[PDB]
Design a protein around this ligand. Structure first.
Ligand SMILES: [Cl-]
Ligand SMILES: [Cl-]
Ligand SMILES: [Zn+2]
Ligand SMILES: [Zn+2]
Lengths: 179, 179
């Protein structure tokens, strides 16, 4: 089932998401829907708040670059990942500027600086404890999605001028769609 | 002004706290009250949620271990600290086992394993960007309080028997006994 996506400036995107008490059948079904929704919209990541549910769950799928080094244990790509209750346990001092987009801010893309590498503990689809050590786009996607769980969209890091233009561009597309 | 402290098993202690949008006079007043409430109850730290407000604000005062290396340039004690919107930007992989208490779990103490050192970016009392590089008890307290902002009391890391023993100790300790 392909779910509807909450878009800015919907205030639901600004509220923090709660911890999942246990990974049961009902969490798995939500995770299936979230993944189907992400794949249907051609996204690399998706937080539950983006489908209207305030729980600390995200899914990711970062394909390998069509190619024209890693630290031992780290990954630059992969998935699908189901990441529940993520906890940051290590984060790089080195930062990288990359272009980001988001399904909750459709049609707007901008450059954001974040740590290059991050290690995160989480519960997986099966309810088992895991660790993901992430670099490159995998680390990028993961931090972007963790922001959603804390009630943060990537516009927060931009100047007020760009943020407001972004929000007004999302709405003008929706208002122009209704002419 | 001395506020009443929310104590376990109050469900409010399990909800996540929200980002503070602007550090205005209403925020400083809440911080003033949190300091007074902390001093009055003999505490080293306090999160806003412990006084019933779900916002990302904590205060600490740690006054002046062969289980930890003393690292140059990290604070072992100090304060008073007003820490708003804390963001963890670095965290040690070395950990340490230390005894903790909590004003929301009065009368109960136990040993908890946490990272030895943390670096945290934050806004201070006047809304200015700051950074704290903490170790020793300063970092233990800071981590304990950040946990509250995320809906976690230290009983989470203990076995269920101990968590429920502690909670029962609180329920009994809150009755002044009719002798
Ligand atoms: Cl976890
Ligand atoms: Cl900050
Ligand atoms: Zn997004
Ligand atoms: Zn506490």
């Amino acid at each position: 089932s392909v779910l509807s996506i909450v878009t800015v400036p919907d205030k639901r995107l600004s509220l923090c998401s709660e911890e999942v008490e246990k990974v049961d059948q009902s969490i798995r079904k939500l995770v299936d829907d979230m993944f189907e929704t992400m794949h249907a919209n051609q996204g690399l990541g998706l937080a539950a708040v983006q489908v209207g549910v305030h729980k600390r769950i995200l899914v990711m799928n970062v394909p390998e670059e069509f190619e024209d080094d890693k630290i031992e244990g780290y990954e630059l790509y992969g998935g699908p990942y189901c990441i529940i209750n993520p906890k940051i346990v290590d984060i790089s001092q080195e930062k990288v500027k990359l272009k980001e987009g988001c399904l909750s801010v459709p049609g707007y893309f901008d450059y954001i600086v974040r740590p290059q590498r991050i290690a995160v503990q989480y519960l997986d689809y099966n309810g088992n404890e895991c660790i993901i050590k992430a670099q490159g786009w995998l680390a990028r996607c993961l931090q972007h999605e963790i922001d959603h769980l804390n009630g943060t969209v990537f516009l927060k890091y931009l100047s007020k001028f760009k943020r407001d233009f972004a929000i007004e561009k999302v709405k003008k597309k929706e208002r122009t769609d209704l002419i």
